[PDB]
Structure 1
Amino acid sequence: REDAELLVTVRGGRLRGIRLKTPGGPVSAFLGIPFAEPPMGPRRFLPPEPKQPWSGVVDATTFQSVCYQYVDTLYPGFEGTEMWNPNRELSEDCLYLNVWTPYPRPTSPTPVLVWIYGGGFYSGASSLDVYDGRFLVQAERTVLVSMNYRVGAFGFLALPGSREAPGNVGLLDQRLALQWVQENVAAFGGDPTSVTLFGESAGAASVGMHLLSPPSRGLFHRAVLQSGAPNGPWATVGMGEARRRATQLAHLVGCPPNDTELVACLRTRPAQVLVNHEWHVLPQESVFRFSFVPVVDGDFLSDTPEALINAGDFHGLQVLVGVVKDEGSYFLVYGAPGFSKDNESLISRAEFLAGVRVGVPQVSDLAAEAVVLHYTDWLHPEDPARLREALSDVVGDHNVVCPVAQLAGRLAAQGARVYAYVFEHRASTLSWPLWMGVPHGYEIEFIFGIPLDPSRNYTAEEKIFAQRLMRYWANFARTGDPNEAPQWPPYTAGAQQYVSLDLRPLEVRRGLRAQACAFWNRFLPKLLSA
């Protein structure tokens, strides 16, 4: 009758899962497991509370609701943007996690991968097709866990010092899920002593912040940061600016009639009302800037991530970090003047100079001049194709590449063993224009083995590539070393060695854009202080 492999008892009660099909065999999935009380009504903006025990059997056969978030409408119906939009109904009752295990369930402790999705801390969901864990679990025989966490104002609105809206509760949602993994993953066959965190963009920034927060450190053992870092200029906000943004949001939604009255009024508004106004609390026009992000208030982060990275002892830590070939191109169509996915975006010098202030917001004119000096080819100062690639480099280096390069350099120089990559394969199914190259976020589908889905149109070569990348990632989760063949050397602050990931065998190189990142990481901070 009923498959005993799909019945699991966790600390809170009983669950019923579903058997999933994959080209290489079945997989056990437990989707929509509640790990927190629904953060609704008076519980909104508050830290999550552990889910109370239940009687009966929870149906864990389908994904649960997506946390309330903005839905992108720039190119309606376009696959390049719809693949990131919510594929389930929106709700504040969204604190659920998902578990994939081999079928039948492992009888021996199995290494655990925990996925934290990205989306600028304002969007994302564990239920997106591109995060389907069935292929990783079947091919590499790990336990895969992913959780939903609150985004936008619901997860990161902060009136610092107030208890009604302390901030960082979305990060606490992630920590609660990691604590749930420690207490319950063995019931699925997972090994709670071998937990690897991996995430992309804001998910990678989240992974980095769990590395720098002592209460989260005991919950995992290895970390993978893809196209993101906690020291990115978009990843955190100071207490003063957080209070300003929280206050303006209240004003824009008709609040208030102290912090208590302000939060109480915010709690009376429908969730969609807060979503409709959250982008308007940003101080200026920009790309790669987000309204409600983690706040540095001395609690979750006792100091800025950059400060915590410099003062940290990282011996015994192994981290896998990397970027895609063209980190900046995706963001240019959301505000940079002259850009669009439907033409070549061959911009003029005037549009380039205007894009610099959009891509590098909230800096002095002198700082902007330094950017223009560094990213101008003064033998071809007005060539539109060069200007298009240059502004993509500005946005990509400033927000992703150089923050990741700095994290990798400091971690390596202070005990950690770092492996660095650059993902350089443009998917044959990529629907973005060719000038965007390999855009932000389009390595994920290969890490998750999506090309193995036979109902998709990836090539035979791309399937072998996905299997290669799944092996690297799983090798790292098992041993802290992706290697098995051309060897992948560790990244060091001196040699700065990394590998390129594409259809060709591994190629070792030096320097994660060393010349450009010396500007962003070494000189520009000095310029802004004086």
Structure 2
Amino acid sequence: TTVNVNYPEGEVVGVSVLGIESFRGVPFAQPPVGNLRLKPPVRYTENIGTKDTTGIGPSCPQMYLSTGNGELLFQLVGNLINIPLFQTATLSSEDCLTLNIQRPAGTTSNSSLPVLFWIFGGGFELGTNQYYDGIDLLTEGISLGEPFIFVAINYRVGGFGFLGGKEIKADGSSNLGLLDQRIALEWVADNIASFGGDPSKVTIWGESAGSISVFDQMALYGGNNKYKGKALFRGGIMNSGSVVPAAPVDGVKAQAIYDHVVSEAGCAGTSDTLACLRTVDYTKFLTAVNSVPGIVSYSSIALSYLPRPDGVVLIDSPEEIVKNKQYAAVPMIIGDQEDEGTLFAVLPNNITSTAKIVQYFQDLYFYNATKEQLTAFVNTYPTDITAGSPFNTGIFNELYPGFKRLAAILGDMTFTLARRAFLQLCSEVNPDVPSWSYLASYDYGFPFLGTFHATDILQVFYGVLPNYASGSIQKYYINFVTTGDPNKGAAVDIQWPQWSAKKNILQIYATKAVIVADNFRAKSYEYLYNNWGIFRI
């Protein structure tokens, strides 16, 4: 029970169980090590012959926790996991540019199935394809309706993926994680066909950083998603991310991280700082990049690492890119969990007032907004305990005072009201490029967090628990990849309306779904839309 495949780069061996044949950790690019560290990936020139992917793939270097920032226990854990035994135990190395392919069983060079290409989210600091297993997701596609190929990729995070500033910029070494994603895609154009894939029936799916990534791909190179004269993908599914306004890669925040990253790495004062870092051994290296503030901190979503406009790969701030019609527009489904904020609001329990909230954004989030506007945006948000997230929970779930408020805010600005804003602009500049959006509520009443960020990965992606939300979301996605419309393919219980028609979205409870106005929290949404620019993070 093993297989088999031969392709232009090489040939591969996979193991099939219960109707799915999976190849894990197939190489897609040169291992970005030695001098290739901190530089764009390169597709393999010379055929790599035969490798076993019977195994478990690697992960690129993780940043679960800061080695230099945060509370002391977290720093301690961050340093420890960084040691060689731990990385080895978990298979994490600079040698990460590999990918996973999972198929129905028996599929062949003529099978010509559509492609589902996943991008994991870890807030650009972590994540890997290791635990996203395609199986009953692919199983449902087979279980009825439409079979497909599943692709899960690995890409550089933290320092490896998204180091910033001056020096990186000159080298054209910006936004490597993005490039990794792009090169993976190109590999799909060339090689996926040997696997019985249909090229350019390719739909890209992402969550969190993955979702933000999907939009970034459409945006890449001023929106040209054309490889060898053919479109790289035909559709996009984004869960809980899309447009993110960021200051330029040349920017104060990015130059500073880079400056302390070096200082920690002892390449400082060297003539060529950048050149030097590729000098440094991996363990010392990981430790320096992870020195920065991390997601699991007070810093929260003011990420040390994210994509930043550089003007080639990422020519402009993403909101502007939409406005200027400089992205590849393709059919899309975009979603948010009802309570995206809550997880993010937990750590900064400092922030007990708008005046407090304001200073917080001003210290760390937006250097471009005056105290005047921010105070206005936040004020769009009530202090009322009832008004917060988890939404519709009354006086309950108030972890500390203002938590629900902050959660609503962090959740909105970044994701939920970020999404409609994308939708409105997308409707304006590319009307006639269809789109659908939804709200997840299947986890209502879960204490404190409600239907929180990344709840989907379980409920939808692994389909736990099995129920109305699972079958329904899946059917829609499965249909979408197969047909390019959520509603077409399989028979669907509720016809999911285009967002632009009546500005409606689907709201899915565990056992029910319904159609509602995507109009909530309008004044907050409105201030943001009118003012999206000052929120460049």
Deviations along 1:373-404, one digit per CA (max 9) or x if unpaired, are 22234799998947332111011011111221
CA distance in 1, matches of 2:306, 2:29: 21
Secondary structure at the counterpart of residue 475 of structure 1: helix
Is the 8 Å Cα contact of residues 110 and 190 (structure 1) preserved in structure 2?
A: yes
1:448 counterpart (443, 451, 461)? 461
Deviations along 1:319-345, one digit per CA (max 9) or x if unpaired, are 10010010000112233338xxxxxxx
Counterpart residue identity of residue 254, structure 1: G
Counterpart residue identity of residue 253, structure 1: A
Cα drift, residue 215 of structure 1: 4.0
1:518 counterpart (522, 526, 530)? 526
The farther-off stretch of 271-280 and 416-425 is: 271-280
Cα drift, residue 449 of structure 1: 3.5
Secondary structure at the counterpart of residue 436 of structure 1: coil
Cα drift, residue 369 of structure 1: 2.1
Q: 2:138 is matched with which residue?
A: 137
The farther-off stretch of 515-524 and 29-38 is: 515-524
Cα drift, residue 294 of structure 1: 1.6
Q: 1:470 is matched with which residue?
A: 474
1:375 counterpart (381, 399, 403)? 381
CA distance in 2, matches of 1:330, 1:526: 24
Q: 2:69 is matched with which residue?
A: none
2:407 counterpart (372, 380, 392)? 392
Cα drift, residue 64 of structure 1: 1.9
Is the 8 Å Cα contact of residues 426 and 438 (structure 1) preserved in structure 2?
A: yes
Matches within 5 A, 1:184-223: 184-213=191-220, 214-217=223-226, 218-223=231-236
Cα drift, residue 75 of structure 1: 13
Structure 2 residue ranges without an equivalent (≥5): 66-72, 78-85, 142-146, 389-394
Is residue 152 of structure 1 aligned with residue 163 of structure 2? no
Is the 8 Å Cα contact of residues 185 and 191 (structure 1) preserved in structure 2?
A: yes
Cα drift, residue 365 of structure 1: 2.7
Cα drift, residue 247 of structure 1: 2.1
Q: 1:70 is matched with which residue?
A: 63
Matches within 5 A, 1:312-391: 312=325, 317-337=330-350, 350=352, 353-355=355-357, 357-358=359-360, 361-362=365-366, 363-377=369-383, 385=398, 387-391=402-406
Is residue 98 of structure 1 aligned with residue 100 of structure 2? yes
Distance 1:306 1:315, change over 3 A: closer
Is residue 424 of structure 1 aligned with residue 428 of structure 2? no
Deviations along 1:165-220, one digit per CA (max 9) or x if unpaired, are 62111111111110111111121211102000010111111110111123435211
Matches within 5 A, 1:10-89: 10-21=7-18, 26-54=19-47, 56-72=49-65, 88-89=90-91
Deviations along 1:57-104, one digit per CA (max 9) or x if unpaired, are 210112222111212486999xxxxxxx99832200010011011112
Deviations along 1:470-508, one digit per CA (max 9) or x if unpaired, are 11101111222111332110011x732100122234311
Q: 1:409 is matched with which residue?
A: 424
CA distance in 2, matches of 1:38, 1:512: 47
Is the 8 Å Cα contact of residues 436 and 505 (structure 2) preserved in structure 1?
A: yes
Q: Give the count of matched residue pairs.
A: 484
Counterpart residue identity of residue 17, structure 1: G
Is the 8 Å Cα contact of residues 115 and 147 (structure 1) preserved in structure 2?
A: yes
Q: 1:176 is matched with which residue?
A: 183
Q: 1:124 is matched with which residue?
A: 127
Deviations along 1:136-156, one digit per CA (max 9) or x if unpaired, are 222212100011011111111
Identity over aligned pairs, percent: 27
Cα drift, residue 278 of structure 1: 3.9
CA distance in 1, matches of 2:75, 2:449: 16
Return the TM-score normalized by structure 1.
Answer: 0.83
